[PDB]
Amino acid sequence: FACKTANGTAIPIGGGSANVYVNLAPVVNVGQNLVVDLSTQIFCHNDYPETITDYVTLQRGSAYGGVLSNFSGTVKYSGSSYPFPTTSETPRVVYNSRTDKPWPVALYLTPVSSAGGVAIKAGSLIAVLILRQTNNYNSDDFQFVWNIYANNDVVVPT
Ligand SMILES: OC[C@H]1O[C@H](Oc2ccc(-c3ccccc3)cc2)[C@@H](O)[C@@H](O)[C@@H]1O
């Protein structure tokens, strides 16, 4: 089991970490969602589906910088919504193919009432998402750590 980003940055068998730089909607109003869809950014696969089944969860999702200070968050994992920053490990998504399958993670961030102006700074860390991978074959329990950075400023009109 291993993962890679859209630009081809890989995290190999055994886990590790990678930086993910994402484009954000430049203008987000109060009452609207800023959507950070990682399913277009992160792809994983099973290296031995003939014999092994892989289990993948969002173990933990943390908010940083402007997202932590200026947004109320929800994370959608494989069709279900949970608080973001997270309060528990999600259910599993099964990986049973050698063909790449997106990691079905999306952040839904809406501005808090106090937000206004540059709510996210370009180049700043906005989130850390931990993909936890196990299986039905051995004792492997690996973390794939995804550090999410903003490519641009995000303004909340006042
Ligand atoms: O995706 C599946 C797994 O791929 C890796 O582990 C193994 C472990 C054993 C074998 C193997 C076993 C018998 C004969 C030949 C190869 C192949 C892969 C490792 O990533 C792991 O966590 C992940 O569940």
Swiss-Prot record:
Keywords tagged on the record: Fimbrium, Signal
Major location category of this protein: other
Family membership: Belongs to the fimbrial protein family.
GO cellular component, one term: pilus tip
Compartments (UniProt record): Fimbrium
GO aspect biological process, one term: cell adhesion involved in single-species biofilm formation
GO molecular function list: D-mannose binding
Protein's job: Involved in regulation of length and mediation of adhesion of type 1 fimbriae (but not necessary for the production of fimbriae). Adhesin responsible for the binding to D-mannose. It is laterally positioned at intervals in the structure of the type 1 fimbriae. In order to integrate FimH in the fimbriae FimF and FimG are needed.
Protein name: Type 1 fimbrin D-mannose specific adhesin
Keyword Signal: yes
